[PDB]
Structure 1
Amino acid sequence: TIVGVKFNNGVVIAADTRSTQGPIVADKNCAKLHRISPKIWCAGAGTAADTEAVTQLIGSNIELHSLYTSREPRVVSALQMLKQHLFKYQGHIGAYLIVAGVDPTGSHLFSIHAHGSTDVGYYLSLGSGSLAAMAVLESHWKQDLTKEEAIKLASDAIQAGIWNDLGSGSNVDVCVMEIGKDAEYLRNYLTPNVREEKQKSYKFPRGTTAVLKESIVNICD
């Protein structure tokens, strides 16, 4: 589940922290919020490796562009570079991205699909949990959100995904990008799925396991 919400003086993106391999949870606290540049952040759904790899490639090329032009990177550059790259590969690079940030031009919020189509919006959701999250966004979103209202709406929209979507779970990660200030990355902003204390310690009596051979390994020279 990933969301972006625009507000008066910026944009906020949020994501859940569940990674899955078939029906199994691979990672209970992965970070789906990626930095393209200091004030342009990316939320990724789809093939996990594809969203990380495409975010890093454009992030690298954006850094070089920024140095070449002596200018702050713009979101529209991240957008154009991502879409042209995803298009060239005709959807085989399974990257679904909510791209948000602030630049000299102002605050921006975009969605990118694997085939290279882009969307403009004030609120967006992507991933398996996008319908749960969009129900909350379509119920609560209004024009002229404050910072605190936008963070609450975004985390509420992710919670809908955590609870009602099997593809989403664990914690809520937020990144706030406000015009004028530094982007603040709130890692594990909300942690409503703490594992309850277990009934028992499965700590084994030492010498339980049967051993055939020992040896010191040499890692030295």
Structure 2
Amino acid sequence: TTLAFRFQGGIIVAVDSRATAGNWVASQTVKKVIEINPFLLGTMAGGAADCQFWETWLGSQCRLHELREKERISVAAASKILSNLVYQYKGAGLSMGTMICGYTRKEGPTIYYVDSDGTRLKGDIFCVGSGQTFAYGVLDSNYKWDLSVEDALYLGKRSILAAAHRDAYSGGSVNLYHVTEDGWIYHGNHDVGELFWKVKEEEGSFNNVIG
């Protein structure tokens, strides 16, 4: 379960930390965000290897663009390298759903959904993975453009927790990122183990569980 949304205060990026092999839980302590450069984030959902290998390879290709053109790569052009790569492997069975989230002066704050089908879309709000629908549910019914950084961080966290709870194939912990003019800032790892009870008390929600 991964999401990225755009608002007054830049971009919010939030991801779960669960790796599965069917109904086996492989890990609860996984990074699903690649920090490409101080102003570019990539999110990972789908085949674990496929995401990791090719988003690491994107990292290299972006660095090669800085050396060549003496200029930070655009989000548009970064998303389109991954997009064009993936498109060459179409039919072969690659599996990745990814958001390229970053700030350039030229573009402003920008999000690209790119998936292994070849689909490349600009937008303000994406949720990607088996948990996407659970996340959309909470996010779409609380989103405004005019949220505070603090409230937008919370909504992002609260929208991953939501999907961590219902979707059997999501959970572990929430990783939070904020993307501004000054780049990305990491807003920490939140173990669903302790987050759920702190939120249920404080928010008075999750009334369906006995606690």
TM-score bin (small chain) = 0.7 to 0.9
CA distance in 2, matches of 1:19, 1:36: 21
Which amino acid in 1 is paired with 2:79? L
Match of 1:147 in 2: 149
Residue identity matched to 1:192:
V
Query: Partners in 2 of 1:175 and 1:168 — Cα distance?
Result: 18
| Structure 2 contact 46–97 (Cα < 8 Å) conserved | yes
8 Å contact kept, 1:12–1:100: no
| 1:32 has 2:32 as partner | yes
Cα deviation code 1:99-143 (max 9, x no counterpart): 111112211012111111012221110000000001111111112
Q: Distance in 2 between matches of 1:113 and 1:71?
A: 26
Paired position in structure 1 for 2:50: 50
Could you say which residue in structure 1 is the equivalent of 2:133?
A: 131
Q: Report the more deviating stretch, 60-69 or 83-92.
A: 83-92
Q: Does 1:11 align with 2:14?
A: no
Cα shift at 1:95: 1.3
2:95 pairs with 1:108: no
Question: Partner residue of 1:80?
Answer: 80
* Alignment-derived partner of residue 159 in structure 1: 161
* Between structures 1 and 2, the one with greater helix share: 2
Matched residue, 2:204: none
1:152 to partner: Cα distance: 1.2
What's the counterpart of residue 198 of structure 2?
Answer: none
Asked if the contact 1:37/1:73 (under 8 Å) is kept, the reply is: no
Unaligned runs of 5+ in 2: 195-211
Alignment RMSD, CA only? 1.3
Matched residue SS, 2:141: helix
Confirm or deny: 8 A CA contact 2:58 2:78 kept in the other structure.
yes
The amino acid of 2:163's aligned partner reads G
* Cross-structure match for 1:184: 185
Residue-pair matches, total: 192
Contact preservation (8 Å) 1:20, 1:167: yes
State whether residues 112 and 118 of structure 1, in contact with CA within 8 Å, keep that contact through their aligned partners in structure 2: yes
Give the TM-score normalised by the residue count of structure 2: 0.87
Structure 2 SS opposite 1:151 = helix
Residue aligned with 1:50, SS: helix
1:182 Cα offset (Å): 3.3
The CA deviation at 1:162 is 0.6
Q: Which residue of 2 aligns with 1:216?
A: none
Letter in 1 for 2:152: A
Question: Post-superposition shift, 1:147?
Answer: 1.6
Counterpart CA distance in 1 for 2:31 and 2:149 is: 22
Structure 1: which 5+ runs fail to align?
A: 195-221
CA contact (8 A) 1:12 1:177 kept: yes
| Aligned mates of 1:146, 1:84 — CA distance in 2 | 36
SS at match of 2:126: strand
Distance 1:148 1:186 in 2: 10
Larger Rg: 1
